[PDB]
Nucleic acid binder design. Sequence first.
DNA 1: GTGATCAC
DNA 2: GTGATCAC
Length: 65
Amino acid sequence: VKVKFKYKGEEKEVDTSKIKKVWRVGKMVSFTYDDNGKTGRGAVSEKDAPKELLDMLARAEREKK
DNA sequence: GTGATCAC
DNA sequence: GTGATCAC
């Protein structure tokens, strides 16, 4: 599935399969991605986040340490 | 300010 | 070792 986001301003969308790290900053979801390139970075509202990313956040919220 | 990061 | 980013 895809998440569309703001960083800079050229608009963006990314397959959740290409998302390295996910975490919560306040009521915002922040993540890093890419592979062929640099580590891309993005964030979206925690309300308007696609269930999949939230699944990934939940995954990251239980990781030990 | 908040996490985590990149990019300088 | 600090600013710039991101949604509030």
